[PDB]
Design a protein around this motif. Structure first.
Motif, short mmCIF file in Angstrom:
data_model
loop_
_atom_site.label_atom_id
_atom_site.label_comp_id
_atom_site.label_asym_id
_atom_site.label_seq_id
_atom_site.Cartn_x
_atom_site.Cartn_y
_atom_site.Cartn_z
N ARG A 234 25.73 49.74 131.89
CA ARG A 234 25.31 48.15 132.04
C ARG A 234 26.49 47.47 131.48
NH1 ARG A 234 19.99 46.31 127.97
NH2 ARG A 234 19.70 48.28 130.06
N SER A 235 26.50 46.23 131.87
CA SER A 235 28.41 45.19 131.86
C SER A 235 27.68 44.46 131.23
CB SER A 235 28.50 45.21 133.29
OG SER A 235 28.13 45.93 134.16
N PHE A 236 28.27 44.05 130.42
CA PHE A 236 28.07 42.60 129.92
C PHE A 236 29.72 41.65 129.75
CE2 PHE A 236 25.32 41.23 126.17
CZ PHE A 236 26.07 39.52 126.11
N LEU A 237 29.37 40.65 129.91
CA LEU A 237 30.74 39.36 129.82
C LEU A 237 30.53 38.69 128.66
CD1 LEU A 237 33.27 38.75 132.75
CD2 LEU A 237 32.19 36.50 130.17
N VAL A 238 31.81 38.33 128.11
CA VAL A 238 31.23 37.60 127.39
C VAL A 238 31.89 35.96 127.58
CG1 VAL A 238 31.85 35.99 124.22
CG2 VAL A 238 31.80 39.30 125.02
N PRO A 239 30.71 35.03 127.17
CA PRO A 239 31.13 33.51 128.04
C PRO A 239 32.12 32.83 126.99
CG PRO A 239 28.31 33.62 126.83
CD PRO A 239 29.25 35.12 126.57
N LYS A 265 33.35 41.62 119.63
CA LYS A 265 32.00 42.19 118.76
C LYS A 265 30.59 41.14 119.50
CE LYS A 265 34.21 42.31 114.26
NZ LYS A 265 34.95 41.19 112.94
N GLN A 266 30.63 39.89 120.00
CA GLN A 266 29.91 38.84 120.51
C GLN A 266 29.11 39.93 121.63
OE1 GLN A 266 32.73 35.31 120.27
NE2 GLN A 266 30.89 35.12 121.83
N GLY A 267 30.18 41.06 122.37
CA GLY A 267 29.21 41.55 123.72
C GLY A 267 29.11 42.95 123.72
N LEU A 268 29.37 43.86 122.48
CA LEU A 268 29.72 45.00 122.41
C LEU A 268 27.86 45.69 121.82
CD1 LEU A 268 32.75 46.28 120.35
CD2 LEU A 268 31.15 47.37 122.54
N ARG A 269 27.72 45.31 120.84
CA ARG A 269 26.24 45.10 120.09
C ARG A 269 24.74 45.05 121.05
NH1 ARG A 269 25.37 45.42 113.77
NH2 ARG A 269 27.46 44.06 113.71
N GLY A 358 38.11 39.33 130.84
CA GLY A 358 36.60 38.85 130.72
C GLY A 358 36.23 38.10 130.22
N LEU A 359 36.54 38.05 128.64
CA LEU A 359 36.12 39.56 128.81
C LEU A 359 34.67 40.25 128.69
CD1 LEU A 359 37.33 39.12 124.63
CD2 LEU A 359 38.23 39.67 125.83
N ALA A 360 35.16 41.44 129.03
CA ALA A 360 33.97 42.01 129.75
C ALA A 360 33.88 43.41 128.93
CB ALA A 360 34.07 42.54 131.38
N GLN A 361 32.92 43.91 129.16
CA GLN A 361 32.30 45.60 128.71
C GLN A 361 31.87 46.42 129.41
OE1 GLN A 361 31.13 42.63 126.37
NE2 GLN A 361 33.37 41.89 126.18
N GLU A 362 32.05 47.29 129.68
CA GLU A 362 30.85 48.10 130.31
C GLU A 362 30.44 49.60 129.46
OE1 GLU A 362 30.96 47.42 133.24
OE2 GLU A 362 29.97 48.93 134.44
N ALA A 363 29.56 49.97 129.64
CA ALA A 363 28.60 51.19 128.37
C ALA A 363 28.38 51.71 129.92
CB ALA A 363 27.71 50.63 127.41
#
Ligand SMILES: CCCC[C@H](Cl)CCCCC(=O)SCCNC(C)=O
Ligand SMILES: CCCC[C@H](Cl)CCCCC(=O)SCCNC(C)=O
Lengths: 368, 367
Positions: A234-239, A265-269, A358-363
């Protein structure tokens, strides 16, 4: 999708962190820059890195940017070729039996590095390619996810991902020019202090290296139990956080603002809690974490957010200490270490986590 | 996998080719450059482009801004064009952003984070949107991205994906062409070929954006009569890296005269292999959609496949209308086909593009 094997490749020159700190202090001194030299030591020490590989030369007499890009391209290709050849040799896979070659690198390359490697390794001329960019430190984890998605639809096929970055390109003129301008404008513009610190942190943190991974679909003959399977991602991008992290054209300037670790922190969890719940798993039952070490502050943040024991992310700290932040390649180096560890217990779950511009996160959820 | 809809987006300023030719001549004249000015007009005329969109300014041609400011403007214009095309696409299909699973992008505009990541702050995509930011493919990018989205949707039959391609060729008019033509003309008879190549770059490349909505077979929008991507294939011609690409210097576009002849080594091996493995011959194709990628390229495809003089007319008309807009060009062409032409039921089409590598991409379509 099965992760079958990994390899890494590093340039020949490894510098102790203290030698790199000294090299930058000497640059400040020869230039008569009015800045506290102890700030260099502070950040070169506080990033917890013992030494770094630099493919490109170690400040005082910089070549043209064109020449540095030419050297960066050459070194990127050399490192990727080495890693891919070690990967193919250790698995006894013929290049012609690879269906997809995926790459991530911010080394400017048109055509991409994966296309140029077709002239060094006898891949088939109809090789499928997946050249990604714009993902920075996240690229290793990101590439694993995109290749896994590909192999979902091609269960008979094998694919190689590589990640290679030449952080030492920033020491070929960019850091020198920017620190000089910023420090000299600092007396009339005290707001520039944080800008100087950011460039010093960039000089403290980023290093060179390459990692490669072989992955195969479920029907491939190398898909054997005991290998990690990618079961979800899954991907996440923090607005509204584009300005916190990135690489800007000026040479280049690395953007890494102090607010990153809090915006993380806004995207990780939401990213990880959602991925785990949708797969009926509790974080406490994860056997292994493989977390990209953006910095010691990033590691601390992940540890706090998920209430982890301080040994759970030790691999992130050991990796930083050994090779520094090698950007997208870091989690591939890290996965390589894990595949050298003791056979993970059957049915144990693992999580790869990376964060980037991004700030982007990938898990990525793994199961052994 | 189905192609559901397409859109395009262009900047505000459309320049007649003669106006662009005049601007370049004025540069040579102000700078007192010793070079036949009729070579500029001859190449600007011979590419058979009537006009081009430039997102970046032409009035600063003699006093260009810094490269840093050009990149920032290029980023903003890239984002604006892509936002416009994507919004038109979603509106014409009545699709909500939150219902797109994958956003694929191709662009040479330097962007870390990528354009597709930045677009998530302008269009309310889900925060868990999957992204496919590609680069290093140049002019082949539009066809390349279609193939990659198709491969993705093979594994995700319920999902919808958007591809966009956007290029700001006018970036090269913000200093790069000026600097390089000056030095080259000043200096060495072997340099005549280098000046010609920069003039051809100045004559050929333009700005624009295209976008495509594609869905897997189980998506509600997957309907009969839409073009299906039935197969696709890549080819890279050995030992031709130096013939085409984009180098850091600003940038310098590389487009060697040998490109068109080198394409012959890849075109028929690629296309006839692809077609044979789908049990058809090239003569079965109802429609060709061939990227118009440099001098002789269209003519070369025509000769290799024994095509009639009008089979590739869409390539020539496209070049006339908007010039070579790099990765976006074949999406603009696909848009023309879907919006303005009649495609007989069950007919076959082929998208072909070529780019740095030297690489070629072919996509087989069936209505
Ligand atoms: C030789 C080609 C030029 C390479 C250029 Cl300098 C790539 C930058 C290398 C330094 C890094 O990898 S910084 C990683 C964290 N930064 C981001 C944006 O995630
Ligand atoms: C926007 C900031 C810099 C972006 C650069 Cl200037 C865009 C590339 C130059 C204009 C073209 O599209 S050339 C297409 C043919 N050339 C290749 C390599 O395929």
């Amino acid at each position: 999708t099965y992760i079958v094997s990994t390899s890494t490749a590093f340039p020949e020159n490894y510098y102790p962190q203290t030698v790199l700190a000294a090299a930058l202090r000497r640059f400040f001194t020869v230039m008569e820059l009015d800045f506290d030299l102890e700030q260099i030591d502070r950040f070169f020490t506080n990033v917890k890195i013992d030494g770094r590989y630099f493919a490109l030369p170690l400040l005082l007499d910089p070549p043209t940017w064109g020449v540095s890009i030419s050297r960066g391209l050459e070194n990127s290709l050399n490192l990727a070729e080495t890693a891919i050849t070690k990967l193919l040799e250790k698995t006894n896979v013929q290049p012609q039996d690879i269906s997809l070659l995926a790459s991530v690198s911010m080394t400017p390359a048109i055509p991409s590095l994966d296309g140029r490697l077709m002239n060094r390794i006898p891949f088939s001329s109809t090789l499928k390619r997946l050249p990604m960019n714009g993902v920075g430190c996240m690229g290793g984890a990101f590439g694993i996810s995109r290749v896994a998605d590909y192999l979902k639809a091609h269960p008979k096929e094998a694919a190689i991902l590589f990640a290679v970055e030449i952080s030492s390109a920033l020491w070929q003129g960019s850091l020198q020019a920017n620190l000089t301008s910023l420090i000299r404008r600092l007396p009339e513009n005290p707001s520039l202090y944080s800008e100087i610190i950011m460039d010093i942190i960039t000089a403290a943190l980023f290093a060179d290296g390459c990692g490669a991974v072989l992955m195969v679909g479920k029907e491939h003959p190398l898909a054997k139990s005991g290998l990690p399977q990618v079961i979800d991602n899954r991907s996440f991008l923090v607005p509204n956080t584009v300005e916190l992290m990135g690489l800007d054209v000026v040479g280049f300037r690395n953007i890494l603002r102090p607010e990153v670790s809090d915006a993380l922190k806004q995207g990780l969890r939401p990213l990880i809690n959602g991925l785990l719940a949708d797969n009926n798993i509790e974080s406490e039952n994860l056997y292994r974490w493989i977390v990209h070490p953006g910095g010691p502050k990033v590691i601390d943040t992940v540890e706090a957010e998920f209430g982890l024991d301080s040994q759970t992310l030790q691999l992130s700290r050991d990796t930083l200490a050994e090779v520094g932040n090698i950007s997208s390649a870091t989690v591939l180096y890290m996965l390589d270490k894990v595949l050298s560890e003791e056979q993970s217990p059957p049915d144990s779950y693992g999580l790869i986590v990376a964060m980037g511009p991004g700030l982007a996160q990938e898990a990525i959820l793994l199961k052994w």
